[PDB]
């Protein structure tokens, strides 16, 4: 491997996935369970060859990274003010805004909307398991167009996954610390 | 695996080799019983059977008889003992008449071979036929079996009465 040199490799981390360095001490990328069956419990389709656990884990990692990046942006925003131009959003930090907004019937709306988007893109994941050429985390979302020049696309890929790992860990710290750089415990 | 098979590889017998008919536990348990224990004369088999049977027969008569006693009574024990002994006498009478009407043999495991070898052109059912080769299947064998049953029944009933008296008195 290129990290943890005293372990050769998991088994499936050949390098076909971006941002691959070989770091997987527990060998989690070799579970034979096709996690698409957590969505569609049965084979359903006779053409459902199956999805490798590594590809499902890559999709989950990309989704986690995007969620964590947006989450740290939002949590940092509400520490330095920046409230929505509307009533009922006064100042109630981030450790308490979640509960008060769950009370005020709009976190349920956010849950519904996020679930709708998640269901559509999980249908995309299921089609990938069925055998579509779509790669993990690829929703073909390049509106501004900074995704051409394949070298730039690969660099931005590795950038997104590394930034997502950093943002996951940073959000874990921020939520655990209740923020120290911009507020108090 | 299958734990039920035809008995002794004969699919036409009215029997089966179940985990109860032909289990090792069944084999050993029935081979340690007096009726089938090897090395016992018919008198010994009868004596052991009578001892056990009188021993457990005195129980119900003494406990639930017409002369019970929640405390220990010599009259209750005597009544139970007499009832058990008379029941053993009735059983011995039944054994005697059964043996009288069933067998006509004095030495088995031979007559069968004699009539399978030296021919049996007679009235049959004594020379030929002969069900069972055990020593219990003879006139002499069953007579000694009944005698042993009767004597052992008396002795076992007396022993059980003594034990009941000791348990009721010293406990």
């Amino acid at each position: 491997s290129k990290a943890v040199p005293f372990l050769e490799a998991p088994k499936a981390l050949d390098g076909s996935l971006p941002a691959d360095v070989g770091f997987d001490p527990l060998g989690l990328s070799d579970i034979g369970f096709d996690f698409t069956y957590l969505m569609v419990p049965t084979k359903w389709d006779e053409s459902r060859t199956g999805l490798s656990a590594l590809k499902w884990f890559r999709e989950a990692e990309i989704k986690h990274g995007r969620f964590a990046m947006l989450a740290v942006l939002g949590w940092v925003a509400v520490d330095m003010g920046l409230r929505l131009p509307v009533a009922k959003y006064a100042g109630y930090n981030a450790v308490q805004a979640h509960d008060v907004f769950v009370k005020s019937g709009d976190m349920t709306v956010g849950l519904l909307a996020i679930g709708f988007l998640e269901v559509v893109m999980g249908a995309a994941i299921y089609e990938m398991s069925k055998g579509s050429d779509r790669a993990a985390g690829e929703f073909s979302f390049d509106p501004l167009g900074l995704g051409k020049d394949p070298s730039k696309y690969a660099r931005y890929q590795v950038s997104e996954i590394k930034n997502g790992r950093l943002a996951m860990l940073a959000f874990g710290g921020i939520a655990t610390q209740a923020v120290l750089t911009n507020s108090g415990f | 695996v299958s734990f039920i098979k035809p008995y002794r590889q004969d699919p036409f017998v009215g029997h089966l080799a179940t985990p109860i008919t032909t289990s090792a536990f069944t084999r050993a348990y029935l081979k340690v019983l007096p009726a089938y224990r090897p090395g016992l004369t018919p008198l010994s088999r009868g004596a052991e059977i009578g001892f056990t049977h009188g021993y457990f027969l005195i129980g119900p008569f003494y406990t639930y008889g017409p002369l019970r006693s929640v405390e220990f009574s010599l009259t209750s024990l005597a009544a139970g003992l007499l009832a058990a002994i008379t029941l053993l006498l009735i059983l011995t009478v039944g054994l005697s008449i059964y043996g009288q009407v069933t067998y006509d043999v004095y030495d088995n495991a031979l007559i069968v071979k004699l009539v399978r070898q030296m021919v049996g052109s007679e009235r049959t059912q004594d020379l030929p036929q002969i069900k069972g080769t055990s020593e219990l299947d003879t006139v002499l064998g069953w007579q000694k079996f009944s005698e042993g049953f009767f004597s052992g029944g008396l002795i076992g009933s007396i022993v059980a009465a003594v034990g009941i008296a000791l348990y009721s008195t010293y406990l």
Partner: protein, 75 residues
């Protein structure tokens, strides 16, 4: 309603009663329940036997639970 989503009818979802029965063999029971699905799908009398026996048992259970726990006002 939950129990009604058990047997496979028209989608790749649910159970096949044939596969359930045929898998319930044992050392003491030989082939087990193999062929019982064919018996109960080709004989009305077998279905009537099972249904009538369980139906009478259910009626007796109903009779017991009726007086045991009176379910109607002023009954």
């Amino acid at each position: 309603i939950v129990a009604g989503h058990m047997y496979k009818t028209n989608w790749f979802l649910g159970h096949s009663i044939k596969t359930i029965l045929e898998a319930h063999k044992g050392p003491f029971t030989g082939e087990g329940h193999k062929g019982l699905y064919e018996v109960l799908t080709t004989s009305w009398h077998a279905q009537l036997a099972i249904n009538l026996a369980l139906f009478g048992s259910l009626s007796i259970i109903v009779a017991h639970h009726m007086y045991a726990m009176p379910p109607y006002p002023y009954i």
